[PDB]
């Protein structure tokens, strides 16, 4: 879901405000690579994008739970700790799976681990 | 259309509540949160028995001005008729619960007298106080409302 | 403290657990399993179905008598399911 | 110090690891039984 | 009858956190290590299991 | 209560022999009388204590002689007589020498042994009187240990193998302490207690026991009544039912008060539990006793009565149906009109009865019970749920019941109300639930039950997962996996792996569960292997001591399945991979590893071993030093298989 | 740049060495705001007050005229976060500015105000400490001087009410020996 | 002061009002809340016994001056490790010197 | 707020053979009125005594403060005395007269 | 008493805390101290019995720890007398501090 | 029969909404407000106004004494008796959970050796 | 009485929260207090059980004719966590000599 990445306020605003064709850079991992591996940060990324793609604002509820949670200007996503990251990850997996099963009328406690991994990661 | 239902309800205290929560009978005047004995408050004052503050009692039989005994107050004491009441009194006018004397903490360890609403009352310096409020006592003050067979005085230990 | 019940021997097959599995009951020996154990359902019933004849665990096998106790004909007495006293 | 004294059993930890009381309030009437 | 005590004293959540007595840390042996109080990462720190699935909480809180 | 004032005869009642009452003055006595008034008065008066600095004989007693192993600070009260060293001047010397008890209680194990024998052979000498006089206080001690208790129980046994006619005066004086052993949390304590009361009753006379134990029947406290009932159970096992019958049959008809009849009926019950299968001959007379309590005006008597019928029938497993005969018609009637616990009790009785009836009469009667059984699923009472549970087992596990009727009426409410996280956390409810569900599977078939409970393998809590897991285990154990379709089988294998991947404790249930599932599926499992064994290797690392042993054992039990389907690469894997762990320093792991190797040897043969034996065996040889157990076990086993 | 600063500072004993290490590197100057912003944040964020991180900020000022300016700015930048910062780090700050201001890296204060109108209970504590430290050095007499020549107003006035808040508040701090003249003014 | 305010409020103090100073002070205030605190209240002269342990025991104690049970832990080096890894170039750069890519582990986040 | 095992009776030991009941009554008389006190006059029990008070909490404050308390050169052994044990030396009887009295006087 | 005995026993256990296979005498010491945990009142009575009676003890081993400058004496006692003496020490310091024996100017002090 | 069947039925609304947990329902309500925040505040960071005042401050209810801590931190009602009546499982449950936290750390200390 | 032993198997085994059997319900405030003393009344039990919450409405079962309590009450709080707290806490309590029982509904 690289498309939903432009649902973020910053990107869409930037593009809509842009007066000339121009190349811009960003780091979607922020400072994550300090505490984690690349690929794992990649999984966290896919979780975030997909989750923004399904319920949108509700994923923003997960990502902006407490007003005491802040995001720094250098970074795309709020500053969180590893415990906090595992929790919000579980919540995002919950968003994606719940809505998929709600569309396909499937009891989503009955899906497999392979099925869940597929659904989250992409097309099965 | 006199009494629609014969029972209805209450929303009221139960005798076993107040009973079990205070028993010597059940008593009144549960100590407030402040109450603390006077000796340990003389320990936080850093005072050995020489310079410590101890309240001694003095008795005078109201008809004849001395000691039947002398009484230390050193957190509270139950002044009553005699068995339940700790500070028993032979006075026949005292209700089964007459009054209480509680040392409390304000700003300091200070003595306090509180009437329980004894039917006759109680006189302070031959001047009564109304029921249901803590009234600080100062040294040399006197206790006996009008039924008074006795007198009492308070003294701090000094000299 | 521990002795035989010696109730009449029925048609029910004996059941030994993991521990007791190989032992011939009376001779306490592992040698020459030949004949088969019988105890009364009075001794073997219910929670005792497939119970050990000894310790009280689930029977994983069936006890076989030795040839020693065979010729001395001890296997024909009362049901040799040990009862604690 | 008096403040740390205001801040003022392990044998009863290890010793209680030996045996136990084990029992309820219903059973303790045992203690009230006089001999015959 | 309230249950009252002089002063207030202290709560509970903390009033029993750290071990007891225990004593320092060996005579002062070299072999001990023990310099750091917490582990490096949250891999084993963060949870007993990194992954558990379910929608139980999901389809319950969902509505 | 215990603070009630006392009298001088009552005062002379407590303390033992040889003490004097003193007045010092009449005046100090008047101080003691004013003391009450002065406990208030002189506490409110001048007082204090101080000390002066001055320079400074110290007597004391442990138990000296030669050795005398140590005395706890309390036990002094008992053993004080031993402390004084006055010696060598009759009975007082027998009590004095009887402190060998102290050697039994506290000391080294050898002192306890030798002491125990020495007091055994002195039984006939000292007599039961002095012993029990010096024992029963100890076994009555409030501070008593576990071990010390058990040991005093031992000495009571060993001395009661000898003394026979002697104990007659002390029988009650014994039982009062011993009856609390019958009701206890410890099991071994209970079997001991039953044993020593057996030895006592058989040791004493019948009339001794009977005439002894009457006044405890009407005793105010129900505790003594209950434990006394179990006592009569034990003594009745000793001296047989028919000898004691007329006593009972006299008791249950006592017209004084109900409490008695309640006791006697409870006695009938505990006889039912204890004697069990052996009740059979006198079943008729027993029933004829108990029947008159079902109609009694008091409630308890009715409840405990019908309960006792239950216990009977449960030990009556099928026989003697007509002996219960006259009991039925009231019971069924009561089934209509009752609210509360008594109802459930009746359901318990009837429940154990139904397997004993004829499938025709029990057809009708059963079909009547099913209604109330349905309606009553929902009660919050856990006693209720136990009863109605076991009931559903017996009623619906009847050969004369139709599947479809259960499938419709029962299963949906059954899995609704009964399968919840209140149940599984409890023990008995756990087991009984397992059994009942197993039997429902035994009738309606497999795919139904399993198919409904599979989704719960993935539930959060352990104990619940453990429950459904062992349930699936027993089910697929009995019915066989043949009934299972395809998709539900995918949910199966995934469920079992998933549940197996999170193990908080080490236990067999998950493992035996998996093994039974696979061995039952046969070669329908083949498409699932690579997922299995992938999990098996990755788990085969993880964090060591917890899961290595478990994944290893998983291999061990999955060997044959990994063989017959002819996946040889997998045997290469397990062969050399497991071969590599033989250097593991943790014994509890290594043992499981060797076990896995063993199981792999029993499937693939000698000359086909991917780790050729030339490699393997000498690599095994040095391990024999390994001390800790499991290693030695599995190791020696494998050296045995290959060496043979 | 932000990471290099930290490593250079965590490496060096003394406060002297970090500046030498830092200047030596010859990192770009304009950043000479944020760098110093780095030092103020890096230790203040650091758990407890330490003498080192406060000295460093100051020297870095005497060496170049701008560095001083860079600091005074950063002190301003506090207003926004006077409320916001949590109530430990105020314990590092109050003193930590105390040590720039006792040693002359005072009138920059004046910007700070006493009002129930707008002062953050945060800010309340912040300034509170700041005096209970700086006092402990100058000893409340030299402080008498520095104030008496200061002309600090938003602190020291109109607003007899705010003179109760002021003077009272310095009875609360406890110093309240530089509140005299204002007491007279009340009268 | 936190004790006095708690007294006047009659409400006892929680953890949070002490979260500020939790690790601070020479007695290391948190040491009041040690579970075994009773026992330690009856220990005296510990500091000198540590001085004379050098004679009773062969090994040489550098920490002789203090004891964590009475005085708490007077330092926390947890930062030093993080800053150390940062100065070396982060986790990955360090691993580039190792066999790690040999072990074929997916990640280092689970290295134990 | 009391342990159940403690009773109004206290066994007291480490007494001299000369000791006077005057000292006994005086000392022990602090905590409450004496129900009574016994003292072993017999060869083994000499040096031991039993104290009984009108109230238990009396004895509780006693063993509290009197724990290991001193007399002469000695630190007395202060324990809460047991129950039951040797009792039946006396009997249960003589209830009939008193119960007949309470059934007579108050009529209940 | 239990408090004191516990403290002293922990102190003794602290020398061996790293615990390699040690040796025979040390083994006796661990087993005997371990014994003291299970049956404390026994140990206390035995100790007080020693303190009231025995005036003759066994021989103490001696060895020198080498600081490369000045050697440090090191003494070795049989475990029994070590537990006895240890409790004696915790007790002495406890009573001492309670009674304010040592004036403040003696400062290898617990406070600081 | 309209008003009567709406007495019983609108009582099904009343006691239905009351049944669960009136306290629980309001907390759920707050989340609904949160959705409103999302529509205007798609990805809020820092100084944006709600955060501003947010960090710009840092129906009888029971008065007397204090209410012992409750895992869920709920002040007792208006007229509450003012006395602790409990099995103490909260504290011990409260204390034990805390003890484990100490246990995880002293578990670790083990690992380096 | 069985409750407290279920909470001990729940704490001993390390159940860790949401799998708790108070999550059995999630739908229900009303609690069941049985084995209550007959002298008790509305205002009383309200005053004791408003400790752990705010009780909205309680119907105590009192026999219709005689107009005295049958000995138990169904209560309703404003908050569920008050119910979880109350069942898990206030149970096994002494009142007037008799130990009350509580549980969900
Ligand atoms: Zn048999
Ligand atoms: Zn066996
Ligand atoms: Zn044989």
Residue numbers in the entry:
A (entry chain A): 1892 to 2015
B (entry chain X): 171 to 194, 209 to 249, 257 to 265, 279 to 286, 293 to 317, 323 to 359, 378 to 379, 383 to 395
C (entry chain 6): 7 to 91
D (entry chain 1): 82 to 89, 102 to 129
E (entry chain R): 402 to 464
F (entry chain 1): 394 to 449, 453 to 485, 490 to 1044
G (entry chain V): 455 to 559, 562 to 613, 619 to 648
H (entry chain A): 1391 to 1502
Give the original sentences from the paper that presented this experimental model.
Pre-mRNA splicing is executed by a dynamic ribonucleoprotein complex known as the spliceosome. Conversion of the Bact complex into the catalytically activated B* complex by the ATPase/helicase Prp2 allows the branching reaction to occur, generating a 5′-exon and an intron lariat-3′-exon intermediate. In this manuscript, we report the cryo-EM structures of the human Bact complex in three distinct compositional and conformational states at resolutions of 4.9, 5.1, and 6.5 Å.
The final model of the human mature Bact complex contains 15 479 amino acids from 52 proteins and 414 nucleotides from three snRNAs and the pre-mRNA, with a combined molecular weight of about 1.8 mega-Daltons. The overall appearance of the human mature Bact complex closely resembles that of the S. cerevisiae Bact complex. Perhaps most importantly, the Switch loop in Prp8 of the mature and late Bact complexes is positioned identically as that in the C or C* complex and interacts with the splicing factor SRm300 (Cwc21 in yeast). Careful examination reveals that, compared to the early Bact complex, the EM density for these two splicing factors is already weakened in the mature Bact complex. For example, in the mature Bact complex, the RNaseH-like domain of Prp8 interacts with the endonuclease-like domain, which directly binds to NY-CO-10. In the second step, the remaining NTC and NTR proteins, together with the NTD of SF3a66, the splicing factors SRm300 and Prp17 and the PPI CypE, are recruited, forming the mature Bact complex. Another marked difference is an extra turn of the U6/intron duplex in the human Bact complex beyond the U6/5′SS duplex, which results in the separation of the downstream human intron sequences away from those in S. cerevisiae by up to 40 Å.
